[PDB]
Amino acid sequence: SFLTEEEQEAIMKVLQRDAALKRAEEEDYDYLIKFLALGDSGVGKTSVLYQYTDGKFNSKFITTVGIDFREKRVVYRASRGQRIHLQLWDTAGLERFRSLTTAFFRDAMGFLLLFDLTNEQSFLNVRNWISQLQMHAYSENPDIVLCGNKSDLEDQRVVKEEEAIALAEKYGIPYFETSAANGTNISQAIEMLLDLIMKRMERC
Amino acid sequence: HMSFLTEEEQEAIMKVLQRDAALKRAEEDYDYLIKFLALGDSGVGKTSVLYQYTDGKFNSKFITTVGIDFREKRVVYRASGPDGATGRGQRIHLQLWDTAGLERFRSLTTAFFRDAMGFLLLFDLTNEQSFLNVRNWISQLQMHAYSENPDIVLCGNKSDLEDQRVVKEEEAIALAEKYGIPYFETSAANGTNISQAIEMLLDLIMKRMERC
Ligand SMILES: Nc1nc2c(ncn2[C@@H]2O[C@H](COP(=O)(O)OP(=O)(O)NP(=O)(O)O)[C@@H](O)[C@H]2O)c(=O)[nH]1
Ligand SMILES: Nc1nc2c(ncn2[C@@H]2O[C@H](COP(=O)(O)OP(=O)(O)NP(=O)(O)O)[C@@H](O)[C@H]2O)c(=O)[nH]1
Ligand SMILES: *CCC(=O)N1CCC[C@H]1c1ccc(OC)cc1
Ligand SMILES: *CCC(=O)N1CCC[C@H]1c1ccc(OC)cc1
Ligand SMILES: [Mg+2]
Ligand SMILES: [Mg+2]
């Protein structure tokens, strides 16, 4: 396989869309907040963001061409309501896109790190992903929310919940078991990441 | 049939990104981190121009850039105000991004247009097609930069190869006048106008930064 021009054109459209958005915020809403989802190919990053923004799910696998993003206007409340414009970056997991996607780790204010509860290797790769984030994000200690996705496939689960909770506590990061197919914990995990980011932004 | 990045190519790019992240964390000594980006067709001399500027050296051998790289330079900038009244020396850390011109790297390099505060747009005085593509590069910058009117300095490079020049001076000055951007004929081999073009771009960006 070769880099096609359709693949390259699609990526250029995303970057054009990103430039337009970033120029409009230069300048309605009160804050542009940027997240990035990452993890092995096929763990469900694109599905998770789609379920969150649109409440929909497609079982067919359409691997992401390098990079994409979705948007959602939401209201955040610390524990008054602030209007938040979320840019939700969606990275491709395949190694062939690794250097293009790493280039966008530095644009994110926090990270949604996914593995697949039905694929043990994706869970073992979590610590490497965290290493790459520590090496490439805006800070060596960025906010991360870990998601074990595909919780609706209980008869195919291989990652024991205890093993996942243990890993997440060792690193100090919140953990959620999610399903992009039925929406379980999706908004809870993302709202947790947003709160972690709003608090760290307030104390700046 | 554009080839995908090999694993050697990808490792080289990842090292650059690692180096950039280290640099970006250090800023949280100097007074300002300023970022430029050089772009243009493959083989016009972007890498050579930046190497001549930071190190004063030149290599005849063509080593095409593996996607993206950058060089660094600490310089002292002094504003120019009324009647040549020059201000205090400000310490500037320049990050000079160097993009590959080959199409197979276009989407990787375009991703970095948004990180630059200004652009060094090069063509090759001995290659008319490199000059004819300048208008497309500028359209690509207007579409992808932080502003639809970012600061650009146009460099016609390889001015030392006078017997191979094919770009007439008139057409390039006319193009730069039409777009409102400074134009320099440069040579990375002997240094002519290299520092003038980069200092002009730096001055443009410091002025635009002042008025914020
Ligand atoms: N049952 C179930 N299937 C899911 C879930 N999340 C994703 N999938 C399925 O798993 C496959 C991969 O999903 P996708 O979101 O494209 O994964 P990705 O992480 O974006 N892959 P890539 O990095 O290659 O773009 C798809 O067939 C999708 O339907 C989930 O929670 N439950
Ligand atoms: N005589 C002369 N040769 C030059 C000059 N600038 C570059 N060259 C030569 O032209 C070739 C290409 O230069 P290089 O800086 O690698 O070009 P580039 O724009 O970075 N190419 P790429 O986009 O593929 O990385 C090299 O052989 C280099 O020595 C110049 O001002 N004069
Ligand atoms: C207050 C400055 C800061 O570092 N923040 C705000 C919330 C998280 C963090 C941040 C991370 C990454 C970016 O990249 C745009 C901006 C802000
Ligand atoms: C005055 C504010 C501004 O837009 N500036 C300062 C100098 C150039 C310009 C700028 C462009 C792009 C970036 O991206 C990092 C920063 C600053
Ligand atoms: Mg995807
Ligand atoms: Mg080069």
What phi-psi label fits residue A71: left (phi over 0), alpha (psi between -120 and 50 degrees) or beta?
A: beta
Q: Can you name the residues that pair with A149 across neighbouring β-strands?
A: A116
Distance, in Å, from the CA atom of A65 to the CA atom of A47, rounded to the nearest integer, reads 14
Tell me which chain A residue has its CA closest to the CA of residue B112: A103
- Sign, CA torsion A189/A126/B8/A135: positive
Please report, as a single letter, which amino acid is at residue A187. S
* Binding-site residues, ligand 3, Cβ < 6 A: A 109, 138, 197, 200-201, 204
Give the ligand whose atoms come closest to the C-alpha of residue A92.
1
Place of tokens 């205890």: A162
3-state secondary structure of B206: helix
3-state secondary structure of A3: strand
A-chain residues near B103 (CB < 8 A): 8
Tokens of B57: 């050296």
A96-101 long-range contacts (CB < 8 A, ≥24 apart) are A96/B4, A96/B5, A97/A66, A97/A67, A98/B10, A98/B14, A99/B5, A99/B10, A99/B13, A99/B14, A99/B17, A99/B67, A99/B108, A100/A11, A100/A66, A100/A67, A100/B107, A100/B108, A100/B111, A101/A38, A101/A66, A101/A67
Tokens of B12: 């080289």
Q: Which of residues 95-124 of B touch A (CB under 8 A)?
A: 103-104, 106-108, 110-114
Please report, as a single letter, which amino acid is at residue B30. Y
Count of positions (residues) in chain A: 204
Interaxial angle between packed helices A161-171 and A126-136, expressed in degrees from 0 to 180 and rounded to the nearest 10: 20
User: Which among B159, B208, B150, B210 is positioned nearest to B180, based on CA atoms?
Assistant: B150
What phi-psi label fits residue B180: left (phi over 0), alpha (psi between -120 and 50 degrees) or beta?
A: left
Distance, in Å, from the CA atom of A28 to the CA atom of A26, rounded to the nearest integer, reads 12
Distance, in Å, from the CA atom of A64 to the CA atom of A40, rounded to the nearest integer, reads 12
Cβ–Cβ < 8 Å for A78, A195: yes
- The Cα-based distances of A137 to A35, A73, A107, B90, B149 in angstroms read 12, 24, 8, 29, 29
Task: Calculate the CA B189 to chain-centre distance.
Answer: 16
CA B101 to ligand 4 center in whole angstroms: 24
Place of tokens 């293009």: A100
Kindly provide the residue ranges of all beta strands, DSSP E only, lying in B24-175, ordered along the sequence: 32-39, 68-80, 86-99, 118-124, 151-157
Cβ–Cβ < 8 Å for A168, A175: yes
Distance, in Å, from the CA atom of A132 to the CA atom of A10, rounded to the nearest integer, reads 25
User: Which among A94, A143, A93 is positioned nearest to A114, based on CA atoms?
Assistant: A93
Tokens of B35: 């970022």
Cβ–Cβ < 8 Å for A179, A149: yes
3-state secondary structure of B117: coil
Which domains are present in chain B? 7-211 (3.40.50.300)
Cβ–Cβ < 8 Å for B40, B130: yes
DSSP string across A65-99: -SEEEEEEEEEEE---EEEEEEEEEEE--SGGGHH
Task: Tell me which method was used to determine the 3D structure.
Answer: X-ray
Q: How many CA atoms lie within 13 A of B58 on its CB side?
A: 13
- The Cα-based distances of A171 to A128, A168, A190, B100, B141 in angstroms read 13, 5, 18, 38, 41
User: Which among B148, B18, B141 is positioned nearest to B70, based on CA atoms?
Assistant: B18
Please report, as a single letter, which amino acid is at residue B88. R
- Cβ of B52 closer than 6 Å to ligand 2, yes or no, is no
- For chain B, helix, strand, coil in percent to 5 are 40, 25, 35
User: Which among A89, A55, A52 is positioned nearest to A69, based on CA atoms?
Assistant: A89
Cβ contact B104–A3 (<8 Å): yes
A-chain residues near B10 (CB < 8 A): 95, 98-99
User: Which among B114, B191, B22 is positioned nearest to A25, based on CA atoms?
Assistant: B114
Give the ligand whose atoms come closest to the C-alpha of residue B202.
4
Cβ–Cβ < 8 Å for A114, A149: yes
Q: Can you name the residues that pair with A67 across neighbouring β-strands?
A: A91
Cβ contact B25–A66 (<8 Å): no
Distance, in Å, from the CA atom of A100 to the CA atom of B181, rounded to the nearest integer, reads 31
Distance, in Å, from the CA atom of B43 to the CA atom of A114, rounded to the nearest integer, reads 42
- Sign, CA torsion B197/B198/B203/B206: positive
